[PDB]
PDB file of C-alpha atoms and ligand atoms in Angstrom:
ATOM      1  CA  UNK A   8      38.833 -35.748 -12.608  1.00  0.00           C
ATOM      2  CA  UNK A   9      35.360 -35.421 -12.350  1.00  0.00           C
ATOM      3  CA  UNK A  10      35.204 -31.909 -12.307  1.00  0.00           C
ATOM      4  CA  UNK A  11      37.880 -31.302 -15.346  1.00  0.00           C
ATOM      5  CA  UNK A  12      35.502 -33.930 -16.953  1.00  0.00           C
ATOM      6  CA  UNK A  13      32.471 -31.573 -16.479  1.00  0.00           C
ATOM      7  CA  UNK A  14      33.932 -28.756 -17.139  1.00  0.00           C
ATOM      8  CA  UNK A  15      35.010 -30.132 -20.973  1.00  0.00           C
ATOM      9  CA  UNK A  16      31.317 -31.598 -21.685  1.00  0.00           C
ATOM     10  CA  UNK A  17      29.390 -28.289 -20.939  1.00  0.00           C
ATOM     11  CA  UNK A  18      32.329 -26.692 -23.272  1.00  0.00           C
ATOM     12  CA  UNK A  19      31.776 -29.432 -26.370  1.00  0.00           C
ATOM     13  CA  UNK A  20      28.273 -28.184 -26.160  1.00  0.00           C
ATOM     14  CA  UNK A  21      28.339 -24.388 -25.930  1.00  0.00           C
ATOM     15  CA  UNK A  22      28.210 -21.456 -28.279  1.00  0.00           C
ATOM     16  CA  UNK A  23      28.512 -17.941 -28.576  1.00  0.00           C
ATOM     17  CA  UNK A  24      26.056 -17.407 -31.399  1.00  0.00           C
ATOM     18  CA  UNK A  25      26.724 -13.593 -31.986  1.00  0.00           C
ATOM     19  CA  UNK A  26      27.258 -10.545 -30.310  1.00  0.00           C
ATOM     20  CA  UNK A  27      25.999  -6.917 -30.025  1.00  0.00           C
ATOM     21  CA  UNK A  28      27.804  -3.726 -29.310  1.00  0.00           C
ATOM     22  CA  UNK A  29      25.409  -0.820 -29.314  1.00  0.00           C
ATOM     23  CA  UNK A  30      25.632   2.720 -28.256  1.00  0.00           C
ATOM     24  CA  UNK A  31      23.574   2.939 -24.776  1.00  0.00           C
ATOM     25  CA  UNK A  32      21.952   6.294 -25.507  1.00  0.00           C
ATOM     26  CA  UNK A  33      20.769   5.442 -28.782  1.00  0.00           C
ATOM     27  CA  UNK A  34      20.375   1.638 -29.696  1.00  0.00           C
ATOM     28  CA  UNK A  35      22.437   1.896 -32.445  1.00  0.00           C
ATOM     29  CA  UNK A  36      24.904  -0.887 -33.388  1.00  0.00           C
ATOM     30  CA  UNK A  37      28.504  -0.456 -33.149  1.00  0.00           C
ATOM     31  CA  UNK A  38      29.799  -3.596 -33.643  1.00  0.00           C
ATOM     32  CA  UNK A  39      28.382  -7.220 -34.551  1.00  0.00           C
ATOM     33  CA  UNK A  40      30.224 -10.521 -34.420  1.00  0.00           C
ATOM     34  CA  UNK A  41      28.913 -13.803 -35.535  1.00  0.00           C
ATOM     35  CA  UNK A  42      32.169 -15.877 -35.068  1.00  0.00           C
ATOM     36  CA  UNK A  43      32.223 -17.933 -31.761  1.00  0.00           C
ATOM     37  CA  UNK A  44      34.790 -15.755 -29.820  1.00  0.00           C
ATOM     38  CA  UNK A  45      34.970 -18.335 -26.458  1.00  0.00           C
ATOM     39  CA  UNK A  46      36.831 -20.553 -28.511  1.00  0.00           C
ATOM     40  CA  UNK A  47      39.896 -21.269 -26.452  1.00  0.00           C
ATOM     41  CA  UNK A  48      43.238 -21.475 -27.745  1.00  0.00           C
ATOM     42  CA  UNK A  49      42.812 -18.672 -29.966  1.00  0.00           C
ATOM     43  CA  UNK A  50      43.557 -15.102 -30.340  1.00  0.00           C
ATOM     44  CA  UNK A  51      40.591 -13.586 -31.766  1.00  0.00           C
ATOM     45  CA  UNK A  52      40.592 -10.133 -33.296  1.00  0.00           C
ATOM     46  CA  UNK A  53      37.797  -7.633 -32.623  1.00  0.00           C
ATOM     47  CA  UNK A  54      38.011  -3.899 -34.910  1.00  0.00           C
ATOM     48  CA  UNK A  55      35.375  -1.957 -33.336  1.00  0.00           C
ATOM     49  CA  UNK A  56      34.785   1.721 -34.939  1.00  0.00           C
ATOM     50  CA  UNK A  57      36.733   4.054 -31.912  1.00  0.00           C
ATOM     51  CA  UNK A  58      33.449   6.234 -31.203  1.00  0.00           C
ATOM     52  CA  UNK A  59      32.856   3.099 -28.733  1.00  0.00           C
ATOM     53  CA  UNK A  60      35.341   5.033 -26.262  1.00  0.00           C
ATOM     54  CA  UNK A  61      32.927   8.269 -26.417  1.00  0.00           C
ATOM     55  CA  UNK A  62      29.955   6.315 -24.900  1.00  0.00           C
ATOM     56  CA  UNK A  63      29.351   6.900 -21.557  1.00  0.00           C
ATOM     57  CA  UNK A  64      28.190   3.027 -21.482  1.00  0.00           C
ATOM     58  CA  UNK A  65      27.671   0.209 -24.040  1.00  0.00           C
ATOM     59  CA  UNK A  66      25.140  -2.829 -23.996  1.00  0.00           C
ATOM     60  CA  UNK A  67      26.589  -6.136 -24.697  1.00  0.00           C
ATOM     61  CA  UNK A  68      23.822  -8.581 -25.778  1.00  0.00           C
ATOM     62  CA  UNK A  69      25.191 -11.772 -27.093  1.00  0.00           C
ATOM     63  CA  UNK A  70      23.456 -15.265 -28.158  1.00  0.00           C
ATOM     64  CA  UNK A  71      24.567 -18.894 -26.552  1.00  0.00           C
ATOM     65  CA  UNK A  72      23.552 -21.899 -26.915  1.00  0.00           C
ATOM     66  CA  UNK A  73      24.421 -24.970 -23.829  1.00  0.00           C
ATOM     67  CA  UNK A  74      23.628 -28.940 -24.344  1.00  0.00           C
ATOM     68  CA  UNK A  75      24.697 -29.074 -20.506  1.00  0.00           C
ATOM     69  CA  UNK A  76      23.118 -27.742 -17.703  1.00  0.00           C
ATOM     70  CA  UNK A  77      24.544 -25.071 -15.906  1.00  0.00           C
ATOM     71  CA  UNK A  78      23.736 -23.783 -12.564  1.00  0.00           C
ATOM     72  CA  UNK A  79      25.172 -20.411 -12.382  1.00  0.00           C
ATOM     73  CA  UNK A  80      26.340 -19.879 -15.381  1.00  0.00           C
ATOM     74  CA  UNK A  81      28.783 -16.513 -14.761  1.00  0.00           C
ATOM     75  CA  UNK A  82      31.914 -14.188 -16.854  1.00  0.00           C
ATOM     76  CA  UNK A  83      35.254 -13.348 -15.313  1.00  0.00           C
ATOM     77  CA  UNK A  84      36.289 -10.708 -17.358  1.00  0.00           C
ATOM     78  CA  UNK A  85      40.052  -8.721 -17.220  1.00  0.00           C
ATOM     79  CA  UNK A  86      40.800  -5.931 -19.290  1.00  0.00           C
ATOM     80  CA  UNK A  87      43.905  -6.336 -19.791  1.00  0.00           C
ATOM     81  CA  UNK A  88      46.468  -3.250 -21.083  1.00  0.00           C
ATOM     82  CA  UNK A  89      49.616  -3.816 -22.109  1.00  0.00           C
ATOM     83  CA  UNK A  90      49.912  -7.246 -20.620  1.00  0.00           C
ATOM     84  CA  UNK A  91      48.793  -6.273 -17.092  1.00  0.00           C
ATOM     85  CA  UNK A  92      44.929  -5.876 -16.035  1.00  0.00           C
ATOM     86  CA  UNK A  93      43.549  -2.972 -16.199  1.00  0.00           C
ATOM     87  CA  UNK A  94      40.116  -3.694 -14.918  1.00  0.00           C
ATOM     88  CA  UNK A  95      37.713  -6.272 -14.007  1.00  0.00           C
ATOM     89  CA  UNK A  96      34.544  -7.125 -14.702  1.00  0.00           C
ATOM     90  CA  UNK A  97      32.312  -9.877 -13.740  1.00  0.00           C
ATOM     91  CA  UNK A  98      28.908 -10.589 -15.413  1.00  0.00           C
ATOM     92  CA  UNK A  99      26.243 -13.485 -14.154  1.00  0.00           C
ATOM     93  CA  UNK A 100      23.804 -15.067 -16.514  1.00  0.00           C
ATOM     94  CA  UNK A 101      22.317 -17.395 -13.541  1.00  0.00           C
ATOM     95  CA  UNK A 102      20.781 -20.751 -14.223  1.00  0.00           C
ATOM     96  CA  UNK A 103      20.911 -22.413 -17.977  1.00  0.00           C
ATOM     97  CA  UNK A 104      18.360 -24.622 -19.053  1.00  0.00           C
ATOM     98  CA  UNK A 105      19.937 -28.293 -21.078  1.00  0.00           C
ATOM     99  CA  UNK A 106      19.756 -27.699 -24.834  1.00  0.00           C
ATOM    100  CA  UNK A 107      18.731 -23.862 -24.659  1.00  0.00           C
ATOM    101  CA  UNK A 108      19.547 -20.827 -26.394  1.00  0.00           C
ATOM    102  CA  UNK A 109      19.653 -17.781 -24.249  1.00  0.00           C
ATOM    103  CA  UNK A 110      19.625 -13.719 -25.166  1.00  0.00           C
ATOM    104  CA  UNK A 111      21.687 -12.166 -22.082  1.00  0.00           C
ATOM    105  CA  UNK A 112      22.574  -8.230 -22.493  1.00  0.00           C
ATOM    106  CA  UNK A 113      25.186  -6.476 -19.618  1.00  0.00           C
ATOM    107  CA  UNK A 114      26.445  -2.980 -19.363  1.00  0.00           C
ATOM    108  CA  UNK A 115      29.979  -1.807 -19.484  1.00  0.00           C
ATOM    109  CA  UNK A 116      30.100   1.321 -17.745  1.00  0.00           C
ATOM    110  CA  UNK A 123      39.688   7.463 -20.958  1.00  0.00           C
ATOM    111  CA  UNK A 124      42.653   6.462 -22.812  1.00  0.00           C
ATOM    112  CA  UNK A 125      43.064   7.981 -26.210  1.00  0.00           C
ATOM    113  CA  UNK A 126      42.342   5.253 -29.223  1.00  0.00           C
ATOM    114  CA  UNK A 127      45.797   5.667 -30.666  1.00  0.00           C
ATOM    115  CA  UNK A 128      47.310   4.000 -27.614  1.00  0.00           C
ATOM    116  CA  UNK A 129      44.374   1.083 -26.856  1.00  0.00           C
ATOM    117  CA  UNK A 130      43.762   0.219 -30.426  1.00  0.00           C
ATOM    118  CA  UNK A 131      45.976  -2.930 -30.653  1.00  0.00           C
ATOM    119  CA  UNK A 132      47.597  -2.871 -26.939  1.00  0.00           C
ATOM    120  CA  UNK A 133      44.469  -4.163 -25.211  1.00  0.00           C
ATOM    121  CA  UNK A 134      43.022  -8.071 -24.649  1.00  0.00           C
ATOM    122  CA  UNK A 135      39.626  -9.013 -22.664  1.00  0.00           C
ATOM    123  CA  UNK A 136      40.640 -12.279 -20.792  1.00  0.00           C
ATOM    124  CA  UNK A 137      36.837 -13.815 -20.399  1.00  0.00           C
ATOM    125  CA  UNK A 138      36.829 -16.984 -17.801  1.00  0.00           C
ATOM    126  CA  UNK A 139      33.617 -18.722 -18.713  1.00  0.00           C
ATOM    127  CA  UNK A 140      32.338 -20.509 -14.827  1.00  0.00           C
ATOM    128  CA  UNK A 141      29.641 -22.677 -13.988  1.00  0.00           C
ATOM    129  CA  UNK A 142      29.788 -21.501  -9.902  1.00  0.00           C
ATOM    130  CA  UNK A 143      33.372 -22.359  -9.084  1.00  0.00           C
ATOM    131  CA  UNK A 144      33.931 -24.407 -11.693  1.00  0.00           C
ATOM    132  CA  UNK A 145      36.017 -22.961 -14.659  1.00  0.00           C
ATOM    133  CA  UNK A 146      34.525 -24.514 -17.859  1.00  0.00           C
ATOM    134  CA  UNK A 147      36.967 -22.712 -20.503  1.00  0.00           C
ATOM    135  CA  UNK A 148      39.312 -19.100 -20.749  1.00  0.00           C
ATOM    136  CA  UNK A 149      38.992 -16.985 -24.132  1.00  0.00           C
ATOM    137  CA  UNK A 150      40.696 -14.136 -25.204  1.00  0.00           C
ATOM    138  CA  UNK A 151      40.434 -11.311 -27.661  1.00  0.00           C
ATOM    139  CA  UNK A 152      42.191  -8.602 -28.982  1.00  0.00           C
ATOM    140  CA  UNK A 153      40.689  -5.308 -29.469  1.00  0.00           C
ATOM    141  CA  UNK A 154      41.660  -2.914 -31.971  1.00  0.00           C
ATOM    142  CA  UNK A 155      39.519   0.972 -32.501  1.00  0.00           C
ATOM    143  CA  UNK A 156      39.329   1.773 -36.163  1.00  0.00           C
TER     144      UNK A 156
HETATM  145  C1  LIG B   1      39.747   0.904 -17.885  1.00  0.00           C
HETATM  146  C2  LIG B   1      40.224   1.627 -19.124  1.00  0.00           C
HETATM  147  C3  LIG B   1      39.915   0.818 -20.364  1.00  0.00           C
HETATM  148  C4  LIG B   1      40.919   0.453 -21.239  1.00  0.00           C
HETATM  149  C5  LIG B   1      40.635  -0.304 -22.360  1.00  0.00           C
HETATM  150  C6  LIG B   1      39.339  -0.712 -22.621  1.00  0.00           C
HETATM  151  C7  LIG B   1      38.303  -0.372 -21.766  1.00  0.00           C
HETATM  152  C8  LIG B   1      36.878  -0.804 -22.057  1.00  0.00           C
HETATM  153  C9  LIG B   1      36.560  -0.956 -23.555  1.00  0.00           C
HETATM  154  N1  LIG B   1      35.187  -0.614 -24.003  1.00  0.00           N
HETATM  155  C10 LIG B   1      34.160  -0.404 -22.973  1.00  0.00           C
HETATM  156  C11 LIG B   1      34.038   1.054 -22.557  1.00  0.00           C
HETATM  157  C12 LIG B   1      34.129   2.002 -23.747  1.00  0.00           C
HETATM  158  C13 LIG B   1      34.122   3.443 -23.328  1.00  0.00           C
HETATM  159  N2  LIG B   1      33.265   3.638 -22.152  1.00  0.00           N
HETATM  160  C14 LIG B   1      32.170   2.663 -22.112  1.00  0.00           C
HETATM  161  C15 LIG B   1      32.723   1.304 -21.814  1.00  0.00           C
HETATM  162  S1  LIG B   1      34.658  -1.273 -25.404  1.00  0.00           S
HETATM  163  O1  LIG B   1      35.626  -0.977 -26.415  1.00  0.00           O
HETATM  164  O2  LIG B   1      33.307  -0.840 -25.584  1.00  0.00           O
HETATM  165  C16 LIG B   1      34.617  -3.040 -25.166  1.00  0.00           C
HETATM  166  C17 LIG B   1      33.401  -3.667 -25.836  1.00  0.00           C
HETATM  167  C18 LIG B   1      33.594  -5.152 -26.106  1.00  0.00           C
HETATM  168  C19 LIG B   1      33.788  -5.984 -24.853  1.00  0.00           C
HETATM  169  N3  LIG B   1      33.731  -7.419 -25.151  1.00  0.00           N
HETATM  170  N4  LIG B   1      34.101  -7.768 -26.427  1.00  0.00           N
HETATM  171  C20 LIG B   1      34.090  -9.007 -26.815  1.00  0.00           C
HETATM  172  C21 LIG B   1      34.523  -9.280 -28.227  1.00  0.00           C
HETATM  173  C22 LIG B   1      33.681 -10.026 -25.938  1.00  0.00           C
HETATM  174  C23 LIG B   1      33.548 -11.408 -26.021  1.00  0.00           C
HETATM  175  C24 LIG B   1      33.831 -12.287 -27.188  1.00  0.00           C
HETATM  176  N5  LIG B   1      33.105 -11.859 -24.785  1.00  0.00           N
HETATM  177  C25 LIG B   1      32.772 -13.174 -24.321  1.00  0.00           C
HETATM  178  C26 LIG B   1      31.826 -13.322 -23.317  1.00  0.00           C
HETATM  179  C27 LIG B   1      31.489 -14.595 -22.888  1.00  0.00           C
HETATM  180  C28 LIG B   1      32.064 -15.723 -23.444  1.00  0.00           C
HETATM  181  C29 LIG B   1      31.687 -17.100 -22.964  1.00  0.00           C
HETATM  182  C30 LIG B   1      32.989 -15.552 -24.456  1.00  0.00           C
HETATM  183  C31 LIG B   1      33.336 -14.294 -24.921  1.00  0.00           C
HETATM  184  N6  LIG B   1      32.906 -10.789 -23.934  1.00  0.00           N
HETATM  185  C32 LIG B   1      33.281  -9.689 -24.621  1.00  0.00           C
HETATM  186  C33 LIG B   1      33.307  -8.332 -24.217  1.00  0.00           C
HETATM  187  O3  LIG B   1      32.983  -7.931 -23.098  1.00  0.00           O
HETATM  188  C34 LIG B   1      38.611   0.387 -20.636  1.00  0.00           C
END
């Protein structure tokens, strides 16, 4: 279709360049990834250091790069716990220049670590507007 056909050429020509997980209070870094975690079809594995569950809030600034255009370029993420959400978030980048690399930081504003560490995966549904371009998914365990 023409919109399964779009939604596979913006995805040949995207990628997560790296990630940031810093303490909101202080700057400091958490956790960094360089792998490209939207990857579909893969589990990916994230072991961020537990304090992460202290913080009141944590800034997410992560690195992609598009070939395709995108109009609204938006994140439907679900926190999933145990194999049924447990939140959801959703995050808007807006419109994406062809062929440009883009900085975009969000916010995420419990449960002890002993019982998420392992048992929880962040379902992210990468859209362009309403159209789904891929679905990623990673597992999060708190060393
Ligand atoms: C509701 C109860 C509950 C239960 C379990 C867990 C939580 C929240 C956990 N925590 C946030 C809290 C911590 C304590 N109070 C402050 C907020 S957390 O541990 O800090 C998570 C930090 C990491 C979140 N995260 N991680 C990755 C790896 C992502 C990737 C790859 N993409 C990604 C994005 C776009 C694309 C195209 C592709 C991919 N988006 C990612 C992303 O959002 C809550």
């Amino acid at each position: 279709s023409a919109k399964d056909e779009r939604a596979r050429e913006i995805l040949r020509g995207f990628k997560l360049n790296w990630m940031n997980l810093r303490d909101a209070e202080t700057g400091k870094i958490l956790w960094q990834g360089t792998e490209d975690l939207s990857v579909p079809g893969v589990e990916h594995e994230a072991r961020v250091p537990k304090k992460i569950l202290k913080c009141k809030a944590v800034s997410r600034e992560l690195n992609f790069s598009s070939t395709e255009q995108m109009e609204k370029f938006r994140l439907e993420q679900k926190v999933y716990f145990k194999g049924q959400c447990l939140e959801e978030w959703f995050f808007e980048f807006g419109f994406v220049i062809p062929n440009s690399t883009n900085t975009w930081q969000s916010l995420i504003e419990m449960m002890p670590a002993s019982v998420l560490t392992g048992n929880v995966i962040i379902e992210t549904k990468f859209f362009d507007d309403d159209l789904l371009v891929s679905t990623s998914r990673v597992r999060l365990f708190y060393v």
